[PDB]
């Protein structure tokens, strides 16, 4: 009985891929917002005040 059962490949691929797309998009948007704030902080001070 034990040797017969095995891990499927269709549902696993679909679910894994969907979670990877969501995690990738979330990570990219976080990195974009941090990069832009770093650019803003690089050129944001008055010369004379």
């Amino acid at each position: 009985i034990n040797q017969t059962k095995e891990i499927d490949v269709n549902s696993k691929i679909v679910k894994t891929e969907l979670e990877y797309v969501e995690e990738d998009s979330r990570l990219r948007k976080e990195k974009i917002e941090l990069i832009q704030k770093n650019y803003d902080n690089l050129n944001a001070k008055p010369l004379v005040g």
Partner: protein, 528 residues
């Protein structure tokens, strides 16, 4: 009213008897839906070939027919656009609705317009294929033959040329002669999916249709194209394919008692195709001011260009695009043989910017092929060996193209100029690099507020070397450099990439904010 009686029905032809003034290709009506055309006639009878078929109409000896006394004329209806029709006008698949008012009626064998009604071919026709648009140009009013073996991509090339007119105001007419209905429905679906359905018509005569319909389908398509040309419109016609049309004509003539000639074809097979393909060209403002571009398709057998019909068709058109089976087997798509392909119009059919950009590329390609086939010993001449082995491979990488992928004319020209200025030396067979470059240039030239004006300048006028260098250095190169350095890791250490892109202005700060605002991957100033 009826004035003819059917006497015999043999050889798929009908033998009408009656006293009438018959004329060649005069419509004879057997019902309100079924009609034929007169092929041969004498002072008491005629031989008619049917164009239709009706299930409830049972034609037989003794049936009555009416000789309308008018030549075969195709009527023009408003709902032709975005529709599949047959040679008599009936809409087999339609997207809009008809009004039952004929805009015009065009005679199918309309004689070609004389010499004084013509004009020079000087305006490009965009086919969406970089190799064709740069090395084998097609002008508005040209006749270019697509010739090759089976399953090599001739129909794909024609459909690609017909997709590039999405935003050019060029009407599309696609004539299918003995094609499968599955493929025609698929082509209709592709037209709808690629936003050119409202601009296109499909004339269809299936492989099991009446022989007269398959014979006269290209002429009906040309009559519709002539209607559209008479109101100053540029029409692009594709015939798929003319070998089936030659077979249909041979079958019709053999079944009518005409003697066979060379290869069993009738004696006037050359005239049938020449008087058909001579109706295309560019016409003067007083005679319509439009143009008709024809892309007939021909099938060879195992590369045999020397066949009867293929050599008849080569001696009529203004050049040919030859598709090779060896390249198709090797995986090259589109499999177009540059060595055996010609465009007699040449740079006359290219815009000034494209003529400047693609000048002397065929020579370099032939030199690269000559070197590749004859490298022989490992001894190397000079750095020029590396120069050729670099630029030829860059050109070959530029050749490849996905199916149904439309590459704009200016994008192709800019790619050619980048290749000639050595801005593709870093390439090491990474398709995503050219995909990124093409997408960036396309979006910049289509949507950017200043890129749109740059594209208009490139289309209309002919710029010189210094202005092009300024354009490339101050706008195009910073955008390309940023969008390449943020997708290709190996470009960080690629010695050629730094050697060429070191002095280019960095523009990451602005393109970042453009990305974060949801802008496309080519906007550099703003949306117009």
């Amino acid at each position: 009213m009826k004035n003819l009686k059917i006497t015999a029905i043999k050889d798929n032809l009908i033998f009408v008897e009656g006293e009438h003034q018959f004329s060649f290709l005069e419509i004879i009506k057997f019902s309100d839906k079924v009609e034929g055309v007169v092929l041969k006639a004498n002072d008491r009878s005629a031989i008619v070939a049917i164009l239709n078929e009706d299930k409830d109409l049972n034609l037989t000896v003794g049936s009555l027919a009416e000789a309308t006394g008018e030549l075969y004329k195709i009527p023009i209806y408003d709902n032709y656009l975005g529709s599949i029709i047959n040679v008599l006008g009936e809409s087999l698949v339609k997207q809009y609705e008809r009004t039952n008012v004929a805009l015009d009626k065009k005679y199918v064998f309309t004689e070609a317009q004389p010499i004084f009604t013509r004009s020079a071919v000087n305006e490009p026709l965009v086919t969406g294929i970089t190799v064709v648009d740069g090395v084998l140009p097609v002008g508005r009013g040209q006749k270019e033959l697509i010739i090759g073996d089976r399953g090599t991509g001739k129909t794909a090339i024609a459909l690609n040329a017909m997709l590039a007119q999405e935003n050019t105001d060029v009407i599309n007419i696609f004539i299918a002669i003995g094609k499968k209905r599955d493929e025609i429905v698929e082509i209709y679906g592709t037209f709808k999916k690629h936003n050119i359905l409202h601009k296109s018509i499909i004339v269809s005569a299936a492989s099991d249709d009446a022989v007269a319909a398959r014979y006269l389908a290209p002429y009906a398509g040309m009559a519709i194209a002539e209607f559209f040309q008479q109101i100053g419109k540029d029409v692009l016609v594709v015939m798929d394919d003319l070998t089936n049309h030659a077979d249909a004509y041979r079958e019709l003539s053999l079944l009518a008692g005409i003697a066979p000639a060379r290869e069993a074809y009738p004696g006037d097979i050359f005239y049938v195709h020449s008087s058909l393909l001579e109706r295309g060209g560019k016409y003067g403002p007083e005679f319509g001011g439009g143009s008709i571009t024809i892309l007939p398709i021909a099938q060879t057998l195992a590369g045999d260009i020397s066949g009867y019909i293929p050599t008849n068709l080569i001696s009529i058109t203004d050049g040919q695009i030859y598709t090779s089976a060896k390249l198709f087997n090797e995986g090259t798509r589109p499999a177009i043989d540059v060595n055996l392909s010609v465009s007699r119009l040449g740079s006359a059919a290219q815009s000034k910017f494209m003529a400047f950009a693609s000048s002397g590329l065929k020579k370099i390609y032939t030199e690269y092929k000559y070197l590749k086939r004859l490298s022989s010993f490992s001894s190397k001449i000079s750095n020029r060996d590396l120069e050729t082995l670099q630029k030829g491979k860059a050109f070959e990488s530029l050749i490849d193209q996905a199916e149904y992928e439309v590459i704009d004319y200016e994008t192709s020209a800019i790619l050619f100029l980048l290749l000639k200025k050595g801005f593709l030396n870093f390439y090491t067979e990474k398709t995503e690099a050219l995909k990124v470059i093409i997408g960036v240039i396309k979006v910049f030239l289509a949507k950017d507020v200043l890129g749109r004006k740059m594209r208009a300048i490139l289309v209309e006028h002919g710029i010189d070397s210094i202005v092009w260098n300024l354009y490339l250095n101050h706008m195009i190169l910073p955008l390309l450099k940023y969008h390449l350095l943020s997708e290709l890791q190996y470009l960080a250490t690629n010695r050629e990439f730094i050697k060429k892109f070191k002095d280019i202005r960095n523009d990451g700060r602005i393109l970042l904010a453009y990305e974060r605002k949801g802008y496309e991957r080519g906007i550099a100033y703003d949306y117009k």
